[PDB]
XYZ file of N, CA and C in Angstrom:
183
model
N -18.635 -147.353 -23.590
C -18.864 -146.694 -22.270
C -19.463 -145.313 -22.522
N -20.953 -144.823 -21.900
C -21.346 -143.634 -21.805
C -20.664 -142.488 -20.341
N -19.896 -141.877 -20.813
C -19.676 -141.076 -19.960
C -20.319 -139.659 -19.889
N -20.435 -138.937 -18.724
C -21.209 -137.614 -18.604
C -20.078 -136.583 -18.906
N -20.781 -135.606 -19.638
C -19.412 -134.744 -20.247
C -19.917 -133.211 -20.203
N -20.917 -132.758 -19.318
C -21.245 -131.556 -18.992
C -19.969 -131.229 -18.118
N -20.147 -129.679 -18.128
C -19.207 -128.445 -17.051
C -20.126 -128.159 -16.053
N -18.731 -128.488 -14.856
C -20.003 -127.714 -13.785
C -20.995 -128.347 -12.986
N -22.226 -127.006 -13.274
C -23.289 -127.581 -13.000
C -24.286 -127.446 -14.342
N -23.846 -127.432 -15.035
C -24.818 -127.288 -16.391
C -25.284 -128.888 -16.047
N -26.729 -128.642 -17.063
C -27.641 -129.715 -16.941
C -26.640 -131.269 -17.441
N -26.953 -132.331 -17.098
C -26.280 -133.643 -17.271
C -26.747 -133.761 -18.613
N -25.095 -134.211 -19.378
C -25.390 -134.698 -20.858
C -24.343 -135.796 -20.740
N -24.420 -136.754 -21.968
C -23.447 -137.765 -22.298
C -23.102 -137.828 -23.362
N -21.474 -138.441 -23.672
C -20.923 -138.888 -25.048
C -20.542 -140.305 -25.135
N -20.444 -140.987 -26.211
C -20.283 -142.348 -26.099
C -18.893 -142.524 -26.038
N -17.924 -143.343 -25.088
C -16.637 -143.095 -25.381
C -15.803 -144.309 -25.678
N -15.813 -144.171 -27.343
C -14.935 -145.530 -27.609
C -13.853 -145.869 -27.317
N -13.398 -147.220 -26.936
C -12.246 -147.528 -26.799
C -11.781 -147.247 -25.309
N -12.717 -146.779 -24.212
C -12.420 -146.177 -22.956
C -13.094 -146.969 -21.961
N -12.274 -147.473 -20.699
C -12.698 -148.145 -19.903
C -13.312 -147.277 -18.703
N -12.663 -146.027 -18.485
C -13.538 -144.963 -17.567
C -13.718 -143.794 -18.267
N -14.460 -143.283 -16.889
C -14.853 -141.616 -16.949
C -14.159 -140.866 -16.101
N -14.073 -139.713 -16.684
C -13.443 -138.306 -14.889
C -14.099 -138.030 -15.201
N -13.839 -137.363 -13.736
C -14.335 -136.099 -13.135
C -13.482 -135.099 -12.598
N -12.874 -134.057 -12.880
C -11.878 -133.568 -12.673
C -12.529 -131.904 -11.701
N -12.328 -131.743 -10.423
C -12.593 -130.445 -9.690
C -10.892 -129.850 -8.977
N -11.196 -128.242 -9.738
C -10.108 -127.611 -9.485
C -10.960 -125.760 -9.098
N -9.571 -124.859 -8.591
C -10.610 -124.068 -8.493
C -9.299 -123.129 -9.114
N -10.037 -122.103 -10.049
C -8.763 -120.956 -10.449
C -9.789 -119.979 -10.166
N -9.091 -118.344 -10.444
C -9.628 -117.232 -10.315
C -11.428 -117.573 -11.212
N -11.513 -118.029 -11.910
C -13.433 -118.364 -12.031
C -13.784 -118.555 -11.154
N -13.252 -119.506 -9.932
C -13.992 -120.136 -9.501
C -13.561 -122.028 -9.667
N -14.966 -122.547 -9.305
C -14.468 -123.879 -9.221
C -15.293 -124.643 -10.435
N -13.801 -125.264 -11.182
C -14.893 -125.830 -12.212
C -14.443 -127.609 -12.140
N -15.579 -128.016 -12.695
C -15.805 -129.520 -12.608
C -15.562 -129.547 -14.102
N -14.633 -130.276 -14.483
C -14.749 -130.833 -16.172
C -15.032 -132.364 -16.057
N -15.998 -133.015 -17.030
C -16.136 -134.696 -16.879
C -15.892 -135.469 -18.477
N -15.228 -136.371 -18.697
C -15.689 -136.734 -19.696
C -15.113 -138.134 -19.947
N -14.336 -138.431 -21.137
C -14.196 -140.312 -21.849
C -12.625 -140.292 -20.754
N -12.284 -141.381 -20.864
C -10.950 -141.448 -19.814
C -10.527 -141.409 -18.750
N -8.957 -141.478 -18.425
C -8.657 -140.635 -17.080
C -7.735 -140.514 -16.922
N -7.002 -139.275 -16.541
C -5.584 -138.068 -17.193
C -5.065 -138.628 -15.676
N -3.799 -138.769 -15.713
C -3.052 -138.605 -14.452
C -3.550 -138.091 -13.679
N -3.528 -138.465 -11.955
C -3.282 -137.668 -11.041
C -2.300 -136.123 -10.839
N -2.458 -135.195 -10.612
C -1.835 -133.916 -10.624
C -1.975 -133.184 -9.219
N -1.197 -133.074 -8.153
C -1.907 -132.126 -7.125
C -2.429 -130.946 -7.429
N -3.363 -130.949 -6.083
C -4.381 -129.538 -6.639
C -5.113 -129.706 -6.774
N -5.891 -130.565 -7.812
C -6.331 -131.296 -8.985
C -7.770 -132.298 -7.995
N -8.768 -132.652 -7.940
C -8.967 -133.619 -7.479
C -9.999 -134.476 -8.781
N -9.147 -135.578 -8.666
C -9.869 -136.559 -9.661
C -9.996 -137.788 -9.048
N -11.855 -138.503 -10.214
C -12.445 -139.310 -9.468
C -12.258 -139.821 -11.396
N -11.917 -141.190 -11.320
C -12.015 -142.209 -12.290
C -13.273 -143.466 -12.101
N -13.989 -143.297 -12.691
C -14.665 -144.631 -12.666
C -15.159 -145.352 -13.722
N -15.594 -146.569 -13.201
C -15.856 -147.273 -14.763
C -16.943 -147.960 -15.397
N -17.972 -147.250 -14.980
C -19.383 -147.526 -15.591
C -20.363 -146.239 -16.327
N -21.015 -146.745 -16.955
C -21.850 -145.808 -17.644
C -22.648 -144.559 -16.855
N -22.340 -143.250 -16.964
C -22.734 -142.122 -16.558
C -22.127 -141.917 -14.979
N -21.304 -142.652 -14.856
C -20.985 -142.924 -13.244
C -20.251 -141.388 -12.892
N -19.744 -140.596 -13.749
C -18.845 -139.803 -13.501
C -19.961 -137.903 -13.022
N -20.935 -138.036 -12.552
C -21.897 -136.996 -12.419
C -21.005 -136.237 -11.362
């Protein structure tokens, strides 16, 4: 599975992620500001937190 693993809004990149059936996308906002982290997997639900799991290649933009 290729998942997208840029911050943010930095330009779209990918890593290959073995052994992983999805991708996140994880948007939260602290004193920075609001950051988007994406990458292989998908971490628990957490309030606060908003996460998107999916399960195809680059799906996680």
């Amino acid at each position: 599975l290729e998942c997208h693993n840029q911050q943010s809004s930095q330009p779209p990149t990918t890593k290959t992620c073995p052994g992983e059936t999805n991708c996140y996308k994880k948007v939260w906002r602290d004193h920075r500001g609001t950051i988007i982290e994406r990458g292989c997997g998908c971490p628990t639900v957490k309030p606060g937190i908003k996460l998107n799991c999916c399960t195809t290649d680059k799906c996680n933009n």
